[PDB]
Amino acid sequence: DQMISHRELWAKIANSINDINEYLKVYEHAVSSYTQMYQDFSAVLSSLAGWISPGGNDGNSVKLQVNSLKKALEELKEKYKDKPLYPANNTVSQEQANKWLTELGGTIGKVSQKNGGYVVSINMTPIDNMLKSLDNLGGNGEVVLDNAKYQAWNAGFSAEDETMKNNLQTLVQKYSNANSIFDNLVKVLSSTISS
Amino acid sequence: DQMISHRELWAKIANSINDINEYLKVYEHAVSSYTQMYQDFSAVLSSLAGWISPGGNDGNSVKLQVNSLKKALEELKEKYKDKPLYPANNTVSQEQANKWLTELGGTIGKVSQKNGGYVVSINMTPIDNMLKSLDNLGGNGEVVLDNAKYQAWNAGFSAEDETMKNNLQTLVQKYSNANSIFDNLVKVLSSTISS
């Protein structure tokens, strides 16, 4: 083709730098949103010790304060109902949301609707699973479980905690890799047209 | 400012592709070389299950084939004494091997001399630590260890295993990231050529 000027060359690069920055900011916001939710959830698990007391007359059953635990988990759900993983502002097409959902992890997000568009919500399945487990315990707002049943339910609570913690570390790793790839790509690209 | 032609822009991008390609070729041999080492060590790992057996008069202690394990580790160390991470063949400067040891991390390699020149050998210190820990167990071909002694020894053995495992994954992750830099640089070149 013809010639390209220095100004249009660097205008293309400045525009590409902005496009790369917006791409990396998607990972950064997804990490920050999921981190805040996991921190909120971890405070619920550490509060569990204060929501249980001796149950049977032998004293080796466990009385679970089910209404306290569900209220804490339900407030968790409502807090993040309108805090999507992507995008941080406004909405995108359903197809664009589906692509970013696969890019981040199918079990970490979930596509939902907003303002006539679509977003990638935080997948609340770990929270829904424990709200479901608590309702299957029955009871009068307070349930008395035998020791074997409490340890079984407690282990399921800790398994959901581990799933979310591993999801976060996976997302943190994807962000760190994307960061170093595109930080160095910009450094390479800037270095080689400057000289 | 000065105007550049499309062809000169292609050549600028192309020489960066060639620069990264030279970097990738050296980095790839270090990955395959260290992968082969850890794969051979995992062959020693799978044979360790058959080298421990009940050894107490009550069955409470652990009987370890310390000589078979020691000999297997020394053969692993001797197999890779002349197989360096860099260069793939011949030698290199002390300056050159020094900086390529820094680019590879410094933990996975060690600069050594080979007939006037220098190489970046595989750092076998995790294997040497295992050998001194085994030597500390004593015995004569086979040792009987109480449960406490076996668990302490196994924890140290596990830590050196995890050292090599983590060494490999950091190496693989950096190789993958540099490959993605290459791929995106190729996307840039392909786009500017078609434009």
Ligand SMILES: C[C@H](CCC(=O)O)[C@H]1CC[C@H]2[C@@H]3CC[C@@H]4C[C@H](O)CC[C@]4(C)[C@H]3C[C@H](O)[C@]12C
């Ligand atoms: C995939 C993301 C966009 C993700 C999104 O939809 O928001 C885009 C945004 C910025 C994009 C890059 C912009 C610079 C480069 C432009 C080239 O012509 C093609 C490769 C590069 C390196 C792009 C690669 C990549 O296509 C990127 C990273």
Ligand SMILES: C[C@H](CCC(=O)O)[C@H]1CC[C@H]2[C@@H]3CC[C@@H]4C[C@H](O)CC[C@]4(C)[C@H]3C[C@H](O)[C@]12C
């Ligand atoms: C820092 C990144 C790798 C990021 C990572 O995965 O850790 C590395 C990977 C490829 C590296 C380049 C390889 C080619 C060049 C080798 C030179 O001797 C030093 C500058 C160059 C241009 C390197 C620059 C940079 O050091 C790079 C981009």
